[PDB]
Every structure is written in C-alpha cells, then in structure tokens.
C-alpha cells in the first residue's frame, strides 16, 4: 500500500521547499563555502571575489563531488520507481540510503557520540542512526574540517605578512603600513602556485 | 516537436530570472570587477570610488566587450527565430554556442582538464564539453587572470610608495607616515599618464 499519487506529489513538493536546507546542511556546500571564506580573508582583499561568485563556484563544486551519490539515487531509487518496480515507500528509502552513507564517510565519531547521547536513543552501530541525529553531526564535522583546511591555507599568507613587516622594521620605516606592500606578494604567491585550480582540486578530493 | 508558445514564454522568463548569474558567471563581469577592485585597493582610497560606479562602469565595459558575441547571438539565433525561419529548440542551441565559444577563448587547458575529470565524464574535444562543466573552469581561469593583471597594476603603486618612504627616511624624518605624502604622487602619476585609458586597453583587449 504505497502512498497515493496525491500524497506522493505533496511529499515531493515539500522536499523542493527544503532544497536550500538540504544543500546547506546535508551536502558539501558548507565546507567549500567556509574554506573559500577563510582564504578570502587570509589575503588583503576583503570581498574582491564577491559573495555571488564564491557561492557560484561552490554550487558547481558541490554538484560535481556529489554526482556519484546523485547517480546512485537515480540508479537505485528513481529508475526502479519510474519503471514501476519498487513501492514509493521503498524508493524513498532507496534514495535516502546513499545520502546517509556519504554523510557518514565525512563525519567524526565524536560528533555522533555527543548527538546520540543528546537524543537519548540506545543505538550502537554507527550506521542505523536517524537523520535527525546524523545531520547535526555531519554539519558540525564539516565546520571543524573547514577550519582545519582554512588554517592550513592561512599559514603561507601569515608567513608573507610577517616577513614584509620584519623587513620594513629592519630599515626603520615603522610608519609604513605592511599590509599595502604585503598584498601584491600574497597575490604573487597564490598565482604562480596556481592556487585557484589547486584549492578547488583539493576541496574536490577532500570528500572521500 | 518544437516547444509550444506557452512553454517558450516560461523558458524566456526563467532566463531573465537567472540574468544576474549569467553576467557574473558567464560574461567578463568577474574579471573587470576584480581588476578594478585591486585598483581601488592599491591606491590609498578605501571606499572613495564607491561600489556603485565600479559596477556601473563594469557593466558598460562588459557590454562593450560582449558586443561581438552578443551580436553573433543576435544574427545567428534571434533573427531566424523572429522571422520564424528555425524552431525554438535549435534557436536556443544557436544562441548557446557563441557563449560557449567565448568562454573557451578565456579559459585554460589545465582548468578544463581538472573539471572534466572532476565531473567523471568522457570527452575528447574541448569544443563539445557541456556548459555545466565549462562555467567553473571559465571563472577559475578568470580569477587567476584577474589576479595576474591586478598584480601588475599593484606594482607601480608599490614602487611609488617605497620610493617616498625611502626618501623620507633618508632625509632623517623617521616620524612622518609615508602614506599621506605618497597619496598625491600616486594620484598625480595616475592622471598625467591617463592610467584608466591604459587599463581599458589592457582589459577590454585582453579577451580578443
């Protein structure tokens, strides 16, 4: 007794309503956005890359890295559903399973441990936990992971900033602001290292 | 086979809704704004040019450099469609192609390779790659190219500032901030060389 067609449409329209929530919480969008935010503030440029471009890059990146799970949903939950092979209730479960598996690969056991105790449910295996518990654990792990990557990328720009300030202080021109002179070198290092292609490749490879 | 009048209208309104995205992700708007962002940051003025006029000049600059491609879209796609020479499906493809060609002229081979492997698809010719994968490669190349131009624009202003600081220190006045003295010199040398006209030539002509 699968859900009637009227209820099936009502469920799907509700999922489209929560589409921003699914992208910003259940996907890779948050980690990429935060790492780009740290990198932008690491250099002297405040909002030169602009917010729309940063989100635009992240949206394409989060679509590419989640193409495997997106295809797995299609090949196991959409095509059997359209070919009249699985109950609509079964197809919904078949779509949710790869999404849960992907979120578990990028989560930390400490995050699961605190939220499982917070929910107060007696579950032992770290695979049959509810989405209500998994999603906050996943987004918490993504924020912490983004900070680690953000600190990693920040260090070389801190090195340049300290060197420029030290060299200027060596000549006794303490009045000269190190930030104005440091910025072209920060652009210099990031461009001869091929930073933009490098960071997006690492962010793509990070989700594994 | 061809889309009905009702459906074609729906597609037209949809592209108008995404019009800001097409400007800042497919056209030359991103490179111009980033380069102009460096120019404002290089000089001692922080918000003095203000954000409004920079975007407005960038929009007019884009319409100038996109005029060949926009006219090519007009001739190849709009004119047969208005005269009812071709169907809506092929007219849409005839409009998409000039945009794809322009994005290929402003991208790099390495950037395309990274994203085509990232998408996990099969292709052998760059000319028939999907626009969904070309867009992230296009802007990534645009950001790297803009940083290169901005770095070159930042050097002469750094040159002027370092000279003024050295002169003041050499004269013995270790108490005066170089920024106040250097700012008129940076502005004077920006005007008597007609700096913006030179930047227009190296920015508008950089696409070709």
């Amino acid at each position: 007794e699968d859900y009637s067609v009227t209820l099936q449409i009502l469920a799907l329209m509700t999922m489209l309503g929560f589409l921003p929530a699914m992208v910003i919480l259940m996907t890779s969008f948050t980690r990429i956005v935060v790492v780009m935010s740290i990198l932008r503030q690491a250099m002297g440029l405040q909002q030169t890359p602009s917010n729309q471009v940063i989100i635009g890059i992240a949206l394409f990146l989060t679509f590419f890295v989640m193409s495997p799970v997106l295809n797995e949903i299609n090949d196991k939950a959409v095509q059997p559903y359209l070919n009249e092979q699985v109950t609509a209730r079964e197809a919904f479960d078949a779509a949710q399973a790869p999404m849960k598996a992907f979120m578990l690969k990028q989560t930390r056991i400490k995050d699961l441990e605190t939220f499982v105790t917070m929910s107060g449910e007696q579950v032992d295996n770290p695979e049959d936990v509810s989405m209500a518990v998994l999603i906050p654990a996943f987004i918490t792990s993504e924020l912490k992971t983004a900070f680690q990557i953000g600190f990693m990328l920040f260090l070389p720009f801190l090195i340049i900033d300290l060197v420029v300030a030290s060299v200027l202080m060596a000549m006794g021109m303490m009045m000269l602001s190190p930030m104005i002179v440091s910025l072209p070198f920060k652009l210099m290092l990031f461009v001869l290292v091929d930073g933009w292609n490098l960071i997006l490749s690492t962010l793509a490879g990070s989700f594994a | 086979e061809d889309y009905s009048v009702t459906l074609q209208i729906l597609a037209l309104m949809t592209m108008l809704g995404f019009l800001p995205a097409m400007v800042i992700l497919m056209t030359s708007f991103t490179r111009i704004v980033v380069v102009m962002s460096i120019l404002r940051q290089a000089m001692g003025l922080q918000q003095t040019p203000s954000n409004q006029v920079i975007i407005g000049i960038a929009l007019f600059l884009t319409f100038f450099v996109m005029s060949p491609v926009l006219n090519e879209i007009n001739d190849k796609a709009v004119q047969p469609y208005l005269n009812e020479q071709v169907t809506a499906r092929e007219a849409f493809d005839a409009a998409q192609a000039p945009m794809k060609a322009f994005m290929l002229k402003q991208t790099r081979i390495k950037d395309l390779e990274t994203f085509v492997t990232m998408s996990g698809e099969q292709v052998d010719n760059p000319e028939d790659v999907s626009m969904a994968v070309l867009i992230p490669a296009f802007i990534t190349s645009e950001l790297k190219t803009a940083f290169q131009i901005g770095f070159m624009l930042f050097l002469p202003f750094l040159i002027i500032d370092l000279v003024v600081a050295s002169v003041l220190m050499a004269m013995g006045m270790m108490m005066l901030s170089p920024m106040i003295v250097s700012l008129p010199f940076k502005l004077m040398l920006f005007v008597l060389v007609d700096g913006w006209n030179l930047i227009l030539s190296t920015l508008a002509g950089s696409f070709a």
Binding site: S67, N74, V78 | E1, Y3, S4, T6, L7
Partner: peptide
C-alpha cells in the same frame, strides 16, 4: 541519467500540450 531527467520531463509536458492542442 540524472541530467536527462529534466529533459524527459519537459518533453512529456510538450507532448501533452501538443496532443491537447
């Protein structure tokens, strides 16, 4: 695949509109 999902949906709507007209 998933990309063709949108294409198939639009074609069905176009076919339904074409038959209705």
């Amino acid at each position: 695949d998933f990309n063709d999902l949108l294409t198939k949906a639009i074609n069905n709507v176009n076919t339904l509109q074409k038959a209705s007209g």
